[PDB]
Design a binder for this molecule. Structure first.
Ligand SMILES: Nc1ncnc2c1ncn2[C@@H]1O[C@H](COP(=O)(O)OP(=O)(O)NP(=O)(O)O)[C@@H](O)[C@H]1O
Ligand SMILES: Nc1ncnc2c1ncn2[C@@H]1O[C@H](COP(=O)(O)OP(=O)(O)NP(=O)(O)O)[C@@H](O)[C@H]1O
Ligand SMILES: Nc1ncnc2c1ncn2[C@@H]1O[C@H](COP(=O)(O)OP(=O)(O)O)[C@@H](O)[C@H]1O
Ligand SMILES: Nc1ncnc2c1ncn2[C@@H]1O[C@H](COP(=O)(O)OP(=O)(O)O)[C@@H](O)[C@H]1O
Ligand SMILES: [Mg+2]
Ligand SMILES: [Mg+2]
Lengths: 761, 116, 232, 80
């Protein structure tokens, strides 16, 4: 089968659409196909065809043939491709134009950027010689480039008669009609298309299925008989691309658009907002189909408790009354952007009003890479920009911050070249003003000179940590697999026995053994969305936002099924209800524990949202969290042993060079019952000693060479610098274990207390 | 020198927020930059705009923005934004909401650049 | 006349150098290889793969040369030194309140590179035991959790170092010792005979000394005396 | 205990299904034989495997404590 959640975006193959690539012929109205394409399309020599491109752009071009051309390609030159707003590797449809209808009252005027310092007349040396009897098809608005000498003069077709398209025959009576079109025409560079929104391929798919389908295919909905939803409510972190997505999906569809703004309506005096909204709605309805994008809807319809204002209440009531009246079914779709789904007046979430809600979350790694590649298609990049590493380095950056990062990188590149340019004037040299390519160093400087904006956001992620780099723990791995993956991957087989699996696991053991690693690995293997929540975060967000997070965390986990929710450090809150407890802190801790217990009794009822918690000491944990349901399943994470220690040592040193005389098995036998993280610290200390030795050697060699300049470059070059046995000998002697035998004895005592099945062996 | 930003292809930033201790030189820095660069400096004081009658404040702000966009290049040194655009934890004053929304609308409609 | 902004935050590069302290040679080496190298020679570590640790917890007897060590390492690294004590957080919790701690880290983030310093952690890092919590006098429920939340976000930033100091290593909560939050622990010992000799020389470096005074005799006399007592 | 037996039985079922699928994939000449999936009931082996890991939720002292708390309300035993 296939995943149909994003089944609209992909193209469908057809013998009517081909691919665009480069060619040889350089006439402004010719494109070269292969004769097999003409045979399939029943086209012949000299026919004038119609080419349709991105953002509802089209032109007319003469199609010729050549054997060099491939059948699935069109060999489009640069000028026409620029007019089609496309690039090599895209899909372009082809049709035939029956009506040429040579124009009579055509208008041809040039562009300002090419007539600056023009050689002179263009009528008798640029226009007439190359367009009289040339029979070149012309479409209104095309920016075509012609040469009557060394200078290339762009021309914009202001007007034609017939208006749409024609051919430049000698019947055309217009000359160069004086006015050169300024570059401002390209200032409105066809607003925004679809390639200008990237990084989100499911939210845009949902928006397309909710908007572009009702406004372009009412037949399907009428046949099924379903009432399509009107209200849509985008939301997400601020500066993440909500207005951009709305503009992209409303300008590409070609429907009537109406962009109401929050502060724009609010700024007007009382008694006018109530009229402005009604006039806006009555105008939008009159031009079906219509889209009403109400930006910053949180400003005009805030939470009623948070305002207590008469005019605010009146405008909210007016908005509600107008919104309930959109049941005319006249193709009016309302899209209210916001950034907090909990700050909107809840009366707007009822049935009939804004009901579909879409979360434009922060982009992931591929999303950040795509945003960067979209934004850096104009900067004069150098030949050494490696955007993959830049995307991997940046975490928590929303799209706006990536745009700011690109701008800062370009500014740094300009600043690095401040030595030559003067201050009284500029344009010292075109060549000096050229070059200045932005290299990787500028990007690194800008990345170090900027800050993110979404560090506190809950990143619903899909971790890349696989089964490996954990080591040992085969029994725990297989038990976790049987507990998690099977109810998700094969839910129908459990119905045969009718025994619904539980939806909770507890991880108890010594502090630091791979407790979170196993959860992340199983989430990765199941490919389910992972959410990491810690006790301190909940405790501080309680006072930050009056406990309006704990329900929200479960809501965001439930709206992304399948999901492996993870609770870390339950020891802060999940302690047993002692009789000596008191104070505001203890009250808040117990309130959080009770709220968590209340929510887990509804989130574990159904919906198959998995919950895994981890605690450092199991006996202090409240006994409520071990009743049937909730967190019934118990798993103990042991201290790794010799084989497991060898595995973890290999995993830690996999990413670093190692000397061949370092017997890692001798290190495994050297250690006994270490706390997992101490092995990583040992590796880090060995790395630090090796770095110190290497830098000391390099500094000494540089000083020696500087002291004796006549000593030319010898054969001595920096080697692999593997971590040799001296580093490990110097590091292990500084080892300091983290868990004493008392703690492991306490854990084993608790484990044997639970393990009453020891007599069943 | 807009030529650099035309050649390399970046929109320069169109807003600066100076913040620091009270009486530490913010207004002096702004005035020195304005007088050194030779631009048509324009000053919008905080309390001065906030002290006028209702309806007059929005008129003054709109007039100032239009005048700045009329004599490009220009600078609009809004002074003490704390007084006219306070943090909205909770407020009901209609004039305050109107002036904040007017400032937001003008700032977002300024995106037609023209060196402001 | 009196200043109007005396209570403002401190961002500077302290003038204390290695020669202002004596006897802590091994700790000098360790702090140099822990702080200076990860910032001044970063690309080597990615060459070796494993990332360094951000955060050092000093523990030792009261008045034995802890703050001077942070000043010296900040001077060597030439990074801004932001110092925030213990009681300042508690008194700001009833001033700027909840956001205040966040602001500090923001001023640490905007002033990179930096060596943030937290002295007197014993007042706020009391262990979250059975008796923990309490009302507004029990800041260990609020400021400790806020500090942990803020500190867990600094791992992304390449060079904003965090250093804490405490005279009560027993009462320090265990959440400040997991990796990612003050990973390394350094013991700052009481100066010994050679160390006391060096510290007396450093203290009297600024003033003339009579010819009849033997520093060695004073050092042997003052065995078991901390640095503050030599200064006294 | 019953849920553990069910989970082990489902593990056996999926292992058998994937083994049959791999056997059919190897030498695809093997057509659809009569070896159709059976009822796959929970066997005594699964129950015996599960029994060796089941814990004990009630200790030996809580039962006596509850019995005493009930017996202090049953002071008519000596006259019954
Ligand atoms: N997913 C994205 N793809 C491409 N560009 C993006 C994306 N997200 C943001 N941008 C860029 O971000 C810049 C401005 O962001 P914009 O989308 O206008 O902010 P917003 O989130 O709509 N603001 P608000 O309505 O105040 O929350 C533009 O130049 C966009 O190109
Ligand atoms: N950094 C400075 N350099 C030179 N003169 C200064 C500086 N800071 C302040 N002054 C002088 O101090 C006086 C008052 O400073 P002024 O710049 O008017 O205050 P301000 O910082 O604008 N006040 P506030 O609105 O509270 O930030 C003037 O005479 C300035 O020239
Ligand atoms: N067996 C192991 N395999 C891989 N990494 C390990 C192992 N044991 C410890 N570690 C390392 O120790 C660090 C912390 O261990 P963890 O179990 O996450 O501690 P905690 O349970 O306190 O979160 C992790 O970053 C991990 O890389
Ligand atoms: N190595 C040293 N060299 C010179 N003075 C020292 C040294 N160690 C401590 N001191 C003295 O200790 C005082 C500062 O102590 P401090 O580091 O603040 O301890 P604490 O943090 O416990 O208060 C200074 O006045 C200084 O004279
Ligand atoms: Mg918006
Ligand atoms: Mg001032």
């Amino acid at each position: 089968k296939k995943d149909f959640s994003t089944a609209i975006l992909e193209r469908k193959k057809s013998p009517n659409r081909l691919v665009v690539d480069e060619a040889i012929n350089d006439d402004n109205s010719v494109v070269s196909l292969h004769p097999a394409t003409m045979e399939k399309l029943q086209l012949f020599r000299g026919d004038t065809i119609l080419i349709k491109g991105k953002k509802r752009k089209d032109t007319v071009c003469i199609a010729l043939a050549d054997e060099t051309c491939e059948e699935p390609k069109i060999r489009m030159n640069k000028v026409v491709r620029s007019n089609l707003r496309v690039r090599l590797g895209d899909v372009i449809s082809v049709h035939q134009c029956p009506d040429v209808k040579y124009g009579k009252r055509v208008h041809i005027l040039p562009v300002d950027d090419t007539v600056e310092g023009v050689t002179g007349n263009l009528f008798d040396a640029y226009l007439k010689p190359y367009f009289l009897e040339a029979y070149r098809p012309v479409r209104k608005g095309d920016l075509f480039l012609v040469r009557g000498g060394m200078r290339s003069v762009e021309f914009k077709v202001i007007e034609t008669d017939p208006a749409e398209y024609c051919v430049v025959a000698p019947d055309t009576e217009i000359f160069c009609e004086g006015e050169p079109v300024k570059r401002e025409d390209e200032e409105r560079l066809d607003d925004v298309g679809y390639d200008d929104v990237g990084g989100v391929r499911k939210q845009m798919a949902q928006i397309r299925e909710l908007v572009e389908l009702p406004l372009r295919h009412p037949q399907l909905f009428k046949s099924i008989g379903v009432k399509p939803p009107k209200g849509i409510l985008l939301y997400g972190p601020p500066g993440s691309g909500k207005t951009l997505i709305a503009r992209a999906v409303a300008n590409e569809t070609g429907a009537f658009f109406f962009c109401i703004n929050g502060p724009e309506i609010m700024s007007k005096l009382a008694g006018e907002s109530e009229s402005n909204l009604r006039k806006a709605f009555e105008e939008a309805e009159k031009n079906a189909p219509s889209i009403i994008f109400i930006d910053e809807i949180d400003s005009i319809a805030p939470k009623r408790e948070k305002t207590n204002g008469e005019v605010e209440r009146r405008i909210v009531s007016q908005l509600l009354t107008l919104m309930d009246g959109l049941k005319s079914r006249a193709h009016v779709i309302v899209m209210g952007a916001t950034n907090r789904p909990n700050s909107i007046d809840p009366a707007l979430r009822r049935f009939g009003r804004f009901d579909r809600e879409i979360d434009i979350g922060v982009p992931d790694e591929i999303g950040r890479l795509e945003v960067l590649r979209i934004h850096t298609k104009n900067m004069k990049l150098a030949e050494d920009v490696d955007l993959e590493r830049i995307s991997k380095d940046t975490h928590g950056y929303v799209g706006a911050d990536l745009a700011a990062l690109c701008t800062e990188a370009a500014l740094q590149c300009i600043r690095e070249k401040m030595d030559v340019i003067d201050l009284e004037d500029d344009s010292i040299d075109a060549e000096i003003l050229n070059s200045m390519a932005v290299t990787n160093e500028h990007f690194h400087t800008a990345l170090g000179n900027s800050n993110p904006s979404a560090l506190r956001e809950t990143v619903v992620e899909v971790p890349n940590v696989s089964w490996n780099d954990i080591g040992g723990l085969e029994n725990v791995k297989r038990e976790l697999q049987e507990t998690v993956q099977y109810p998700v991957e094969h839910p129908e087989k459990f119905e045969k026995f009718g025994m619904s699996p539980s939806k909770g696991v507890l991880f108890y053991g010594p502090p630091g053994c791979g407790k979170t690693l196993l959860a992340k690995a199983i989430a990765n293997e199941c490919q389910a969305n992972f959410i990491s929540v810690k006790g301190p975060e909940l405790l501080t967000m309680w006072f930050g936002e009056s406990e309006a997070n704990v329900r929200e965390i479960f809501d965001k986990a439930r709206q992304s099924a399948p999901c492996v929710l993870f609770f870390d450090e339950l020891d802060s809150i999940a302690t047993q209800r002692g009789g000596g407890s008191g104070g505001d802190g203890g009250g808040a801790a117990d309130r959080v524990l009770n709220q968590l217990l209340t929510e887990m009794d509804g989130m574990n009822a159904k919906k198959t949202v998995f919950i895994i918690g981890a605690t450092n000491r199991p006996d202090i944990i409240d006994s409520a969290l071990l009743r049937p349901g909730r967190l019934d399943q118990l798993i103990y994470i042991p201290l790794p042993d010799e084989d497991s220690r060898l595995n973890i040592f290999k995993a830690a040193l996999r990413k670093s060079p190692i000397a061949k005389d370092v017997d890692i098995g001798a290190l495994a036998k050297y250690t006994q019952g270490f706390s997992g993280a101490d092995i990583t610290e040992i590796c880090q200390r060995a790395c630090k000693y090796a770095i110190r030795e290497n830098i000391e050697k390099d500094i000494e060699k540089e000083k020696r060479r500087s002291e004796n300049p006549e000593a030319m470059e010898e054969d001595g070059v920096d080697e692999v610098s593997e971590i040799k046995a001296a580093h490990f000998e110097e590091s292990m002697k500084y080892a300091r274990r983290s868990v004493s035998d008392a703690d492991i004895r306490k854990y084993q005592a608790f484990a044997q207390t639970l393990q009453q099945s020891r007599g069943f062996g």
